[PDB]
């Protein structure tokens, strides 16, 4: 396999975890604060999909600092997973044209 | 089996403070909560607060005055309940339940009736 | 602080008649509402969580419904047996809350 495509599962295998920490930690750092939603294991982990994806429909999100912060990096993972998925497709693209034109 | 044993009661004099124990057994997952509730003879149940004993992090009822402080021991499988200079007001059930992260509470324990007198 | 209010708090039903119990919440929390049971003397047990799910080990009899504020717990053919108080308990919103309850009486 080439780096492209080692990278892009790599960052797959990072972003479920960094989902699922993602969505223990938001729970703990919601818990405690008056008026939190995103208090329970099963809707968090949604929540964490929704973020990672920048989805963001609104219907859960984090009020405290800890949880915000959590979101960041959840965000990033996912931005950055998702945008190196593209760079590994372009990767691809560009190699198969190199070859289509003998070069 | 029973899941959640707690001692059946502790007198107490007021002023005094009591530390009540909750032993689990069962099935136990990093991510379950520990929850403790207050009911006054004749009256409802009210939540006291929370504890993730894996991360040992407690979370209290803000509407109320503190007067627990909640701690547990991992390799026992123990929740603690501190109570603290109580009165009279203090005399109630007090019962420990488990939740799985998911907002009820599957089970709890037989409860532990605390009595302030002298 | 999500307020719940189970009116009436006395509810009296003849032998095998179908009852049910009323819980409002303050504000709107979907489904996250769960009932309990508690007989004298003994402790609180789930019946029914999320509203609707039914637990296993009770009785086929009991059913939940509702969402938003308004929640029904309901009992087709009452029976001695469930004598007891019912409490609700919702889950949607930090901190937990529970209902000041509801005594069945036969």
């Known amino acids: 396999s080439a780096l492209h495509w080692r990278a892009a599962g790599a960052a797959t295998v990072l972003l479920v975890i960094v989902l699922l920490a993602g969505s223990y930690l938001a729970v703990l750092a919601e818990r405690g604060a008056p008026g939190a939603q995103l208090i329970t294991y099963p809707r968090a982990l949604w929540w964490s999909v929704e973020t990672a994806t920048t989805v963001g429909y609104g219907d859960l999100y984090p009020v405290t600092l800890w949880g915000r912060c959590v979101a960041v990096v959840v965000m990033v993972a996912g931005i950055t997973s998702f945008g190196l998925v593209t760079a590994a497709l372009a990767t691809w693209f560009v190699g198969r044209e190199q070859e289509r034109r003998g070069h | 089996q029973v899941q959640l044993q707690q001692p059946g009661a502790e007198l107490v004099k007021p002023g005094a403070s009591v530390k009540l124990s909750c032993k689990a057994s069962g099935y136990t997952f990093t991510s379950d909560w520990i929850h403790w509730v207050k009911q006054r003879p004749g009256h409802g149940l009210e939540w006291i607060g929370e504890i993730i004993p894996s991360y040992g992090r407690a979370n209290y009822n803000e509407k109320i005055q503190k007067k627990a402080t909640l701690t547990a021991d991992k390799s026992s499988s123990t929740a603690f309940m501190q109570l603290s200079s109580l009165t009279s007001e203090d005399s109630a059930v007090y019962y420990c339940?488990?939740?799985?992260?998911?907002?009820?509470?599957?089970?709890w324990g037989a409860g532990t009736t605390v009595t302030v007198s002298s | 602080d999500i307020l719940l209010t189970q009116s009436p708090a006395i509810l009296s039903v003849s032998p095998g008649e179908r009852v049910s119990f009323s819980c409002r919440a303050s504000q709107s929390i979907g489904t996250d509402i769960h009932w309990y049971q508690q007989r004298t003397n003994g402790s609180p047990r789930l019946l029914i969580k999320?509203?609707?799910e039914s637990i296993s080990g009770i009785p086929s009899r009991f059913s939940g419904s509702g969402s938003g504020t308004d929640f029904t717990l309901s009992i087709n053919s009452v029976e001695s047996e469930d004598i007891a108080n019912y409490y609700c308990?919702?889950?949607?919103?930090?901190?937990?809350?529970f209902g000041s309850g509801t005594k069945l009486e036969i």
């Open positions: 339940a488990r939740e799985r992260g998911d907002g009820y509470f599957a089970v």
């Open positions: 308990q919702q889950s949607n919103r930090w901190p937990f809350t």
């Open positions: 999320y509203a609707s």
